[PDB]
Design an enzyme around this catalytic site. Structure first.
Site, PDB file in Angstrom:
ATOM      1  N   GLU A  35      62.978  -2.595  79.657  1.00 23.50           N
ATOM      2  CA  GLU A  35      62.629  -1.576  78.677  1.00 23.50           C
ATOM      3  C   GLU A  35      61.993  -0.308  79.267  1.00 23.50           C
ATOM      4  OE1 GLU A  35      63.624  -1.313  75.704  1.00 23.50           O
ATOM      5  OE2 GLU A  35      64.101  -3.367  75.086  1.00 23.50           O
ATOM      6  N   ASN A  46      65.294   8.760  70.091  1.00 22.74           N
ATOM      7  CA  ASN A  46      66.605   8.340  69.643  1.00 22.74           C
ATOM      8  C   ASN A  46      67.080   9.418  68.687  1.00 22.74           C
ATOM      9  OD1 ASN A  46      66.404   5.571  70.904  1.00 22.74           O
ATOM     10  ND2 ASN A  46      64.704   5.440  69.447  1.00 22.74           N
ATOM     11  N   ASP A  49      68.796   8.544  65.054  1.00 21.47           N
ATOM     12  CA  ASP A  49      68.096   8.237  63.811  1.00 21.47           C
ATOM     13  C   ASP A  49      66.706   8.847  63.708  1.00 21.47           C
ATOM     14  OD1 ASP A  49      66.769   6.508  65.607  1.00 21.47           O
ATOM     15  OD2 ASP A  49      66.552   4.939  64.109  1.00 21.47           O
ATOM     16  N   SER A  51      63.971   8.347  65.576  1.00 23.72           N
ATOM     17  CA  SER A  51      62.836   7.472  65.840  1.00 23.72           C
ATOM     18  C   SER A  51      62.558   7.572  67.345  1.00 23.72           C
ATOM     19  CB  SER A  51      63.177   6.033  65.442  1.00 23.72           C
ATOM     20  OG  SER A  51      64.228   5.494  66.240  1.00 23.72           O
ATOM     21  N   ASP A  53      60.863   5.343  70.822  1.00 21.06           N
ATOM     22  CA  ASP A  53      60.418   4.075  71.418  1.00 21.06           C
ATOM     23  C   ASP A  53      59.208   4.418  72.275  1.00 21.06           C
ATOM     24  OD1 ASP A  53      62.561   2.689  70.341  1.00 21.06           O
ATOM     25  OD2 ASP A  53      63.861   3.152  72.054  1.00 21.06           O
ATOM     26  N   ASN A  60      59.557   0.594  68.662  1.00 14.15           N
ATOM     27  CA  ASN A  60      60.082   1.640  67.790  1.00 14.15           C
ATOM     28  C   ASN A  60      59.200   2.085  66.618  1.00 14.15           C
ATOM     29  OD1 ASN A  60      62.234   2.503  65.435  1.00 14.15           O
ATOM     30  ND2 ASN A  60      62.883   3.191  67.465  1.00 14.15           N
TER      31      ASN A  60
END
Ligand code: NA
Length: 130
Positions: A35, A46, A49, A51, A53, A60
């Protein structure tokens, strides 16, 4: 901060992650590795959408933490996403525990399915004394 492998392994064990909701320490290490590269300050936007991380586990903002700019988002961990960018990973760990308390468990992270699931993950904790 960027943790060294064994340093992180020992830290995670002290925070009670070994076997949490059936997830072995080596799986958590595999997840953190893929990750963020064990980097607590990593963020990933991202664009698809809107959002983001956050942190070592790349949690998220749509469901787990609040950053104010994510549309129709919730904050299940009851944390500002800023808390997930600290050098001290206590809050990130408490939130990761919250994530796996949902039905999917560790499967919540797609990266775990791609690079950890059904693989030999013992290598991530080998020689760390945990
Ligand atoms: Na949120």
């Amino acid at each position: 901060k960027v943790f060294e492998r064994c340093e992180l392994a020992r830290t995670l064990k002290r925070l009670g992650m070994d076997g949490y909701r059936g997830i072995s320490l080596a799986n958590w290490m595999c997840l953190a590795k893929w990750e963020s590269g064990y980097n607590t300050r990593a963020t990933n936007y991202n664009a698809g959408d809107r959002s983001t991380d956050y942190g070592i586990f790349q949690i998220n903002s749509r469901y787990w933490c609040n950053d104010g700019k994510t549309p129709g988002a919730v904050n299940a961990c009851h944390l500002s996403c800023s808390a997930l960018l600290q050098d001290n990973i206590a809050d990130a760990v408490a939130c990761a525990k919250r994530v796996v308390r949902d039905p999917q468990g560790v499967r919540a992270w797609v990266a775990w399915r791609n690079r950890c699931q059904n693989r030999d993950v013992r290598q991530y904790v080998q020689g760390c004394g945990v």
